[PDB]
């Protein structure tokens, strides 16, 4: 029963291993093994549930174990394993073949097979752990082993993509352990984790690997947000080491998602408004990407309210995600109408929902945006309006309070008006008629630049996928 179960899944694993083994042996091809590893995550996740855990036991017995003898026993100890007589030395799939990792030349140490075998061995370990959701000692045991192993290897061009997906599980398993239980050792463990990310990122700068630095920057920028150091994130993004060429669309959307949150506290919403929009277009619309589109759209609605301009309300009702957008619907209504008591009562009941995403602190500063937007609305109504009539519509305190708020927004060019005290009304200084000025000409220049940029980007990849058609013999 259990004998035929281990031979079926192991044969499917070796079949996928021999495909990427011959591709890296001849010259250097990094494109083909990368496309297979994309589907490997989905095929292995479903396969780990079937045929239990016994598919990975004979794989370690097959190939030679540099470090991997005692690591599988520690993984099988937590599950209280019953003895099936799985002791190594029973099943032998090598049988002295060149593609089978010939044993005599391997045992004599005349050839080194450990490079591709050991780096691939650590990949299947983190996949089974993420399926069973194992924590505590098993998480710390892997972090201690992997770090010296990556420092010993020279990390060639093909070797940089093997551990590129392993760093994601290092930071993921550390955050799930802290949120599950808080202790004194969780803080000291994060100190070493910060130094490990920076040492490997600096080494990857010489190799100039596109996917390696893409996964690290996404994990490092998120670490600064949890640890709460802004000065580290400000200088980190100033170097601009993130390549835009071969990185995946899923990795690009995560990059622009962090820049919108960093610039949110810098009081510059001009550049932050573009990063949150570009992150939506780069993120897929599929079901697995719904988790990112849910959090990204919650930030976009908050940025527009911080800009003093009411965004388009059609995004809430037309989308199918409005169930989670209900708290943000009443926030825009309170800022637009300018009701003072409605805004205070909205953030009070929904404070629990806004605590998880940490957007409640930004809602505290929306209290100012309620009045600043209302002043902009009433200013665009009538060019000449009395001073005391403003306090009657918004139910303000006195005329001395509104006098400062109108002259406050004109510093950034918001209201664009003047207050006449001797006359008794506030006259708007905006006559429009910009058709005679040069201001629209500056915007028209940047629009054509976007056209010539896409034309050059159209030339980036055109003939490239067709380059292999001429060299390969056709009919």
């Amino acid at each position: 029963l259990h004998h035929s179960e281990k031979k079926y899944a192991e044969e499917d694993q070796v079949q996928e291993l021999l495909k990427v083994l011959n591709e890296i042996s001849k010259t250097t091809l990094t494109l083909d093994p990368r496309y297979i590893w994309r589907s490997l995550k989905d095929l292995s996740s479903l396969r780990n549930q079937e045929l239990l855990n016994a598919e990975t036991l004979c794989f370690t017995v097959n190939v030679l174990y540099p470090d991997s003898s005692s690591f599988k026993k520690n993984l099988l100890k937590f599950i209280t394993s019953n003895h099936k007589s799985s002791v190594p030395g029973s099943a032998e799939l090598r049988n002295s073949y060149p593609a089978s990792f010939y044993s005599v030349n391997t045992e004599k140490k005349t050839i080194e097979v450990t490079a591709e075998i050991n780096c691939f061995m650590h990949l299947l370990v983190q996949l089974f752990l993420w399926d069973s959701k194992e924590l505590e000692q098993l998480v710390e045991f892997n972090r201690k082993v992997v770090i010296p192993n990556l420092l010993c290897y020279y990390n060639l061009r093909s070797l940089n993509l093997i551990n590129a997906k392993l760093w994601f599980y290092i930071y993921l398993s550390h955050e799930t352990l802290a949120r599950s239980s808080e202790e004194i050792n969780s803080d000291n463990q994060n100190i070493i984790l910060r130094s490990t990310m920076m040492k490997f990122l600096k080494i990857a700068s010489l190799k100039h690997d596109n996917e390696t630095k893409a996964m690290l920057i996404n994990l490092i920028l998120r670490d600064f947000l949890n640890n709460g150091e802004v000065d580290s994130a400000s200088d980190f993004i100033s170097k601009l080491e993130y390549p835009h060429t071969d990185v995946s669309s899923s990795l690009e959307a995560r990059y622009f998602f962090y820049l919108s949150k960093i610039n949110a506290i810098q009081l510059d919403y001009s550049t932050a408004n573009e990063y949150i929009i570009a992150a939506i277009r780069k993120a897929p619309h599929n079901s697995k990407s719904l988790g990112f589109l849910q959090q990204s759209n919650k930030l976009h609605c908050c940025i527009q309210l911080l800009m003093g301009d009411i965004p388009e309300l059609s995004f809430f009702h037309q989308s199918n995600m409005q169930k989670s957008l209900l708290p943000y619907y009443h926030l825009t209504k309170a800022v637009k109408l300018g009701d003072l008591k409605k805004f205070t009562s909205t953030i009070t009941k929904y404070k629990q929902l806004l605590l998880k995403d940490d957007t409640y602190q930004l809602c505290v500063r929306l209290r100012s945006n309620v009045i600043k937007t209302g002043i902009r609305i009433i200013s665009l109504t009538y060019k000449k309006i009395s001073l005391r009539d403003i306090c009657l519509k918004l139910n303000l305190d006195s005329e001395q309070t509104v006098e400062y708020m109108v002259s406050r927004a004109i510093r950034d060019g918001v209201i664009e008006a003047k207050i006449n005290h001797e006359d008794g009304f506030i006259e708007t200084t905006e006559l429009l008629n910009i058709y005679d000025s040069e201001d629209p000409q500056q915007v028209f220049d940047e629009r054509i630049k976007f056209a010539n940029q896409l034309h050059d980007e159209y030339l980036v990849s055109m003939r490239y996928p067709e380059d292999k058609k001429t060299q390969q013999n056709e009919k």
Partner: peptide
């Protein structure tokens, strides 16, 4: 649809007749 296409006003509905009443009385 959204904006005032749905919420509209929800005020001064039945009070429109009171505007003509106050004009023909206080006159």
């Amino acid at each position: 649809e959204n904006w005032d296409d749905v919420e509209v006003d929800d005020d001064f509905t039945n009070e429109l007749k009171a505007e003509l009443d106050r004009y023909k009385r206080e006159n």
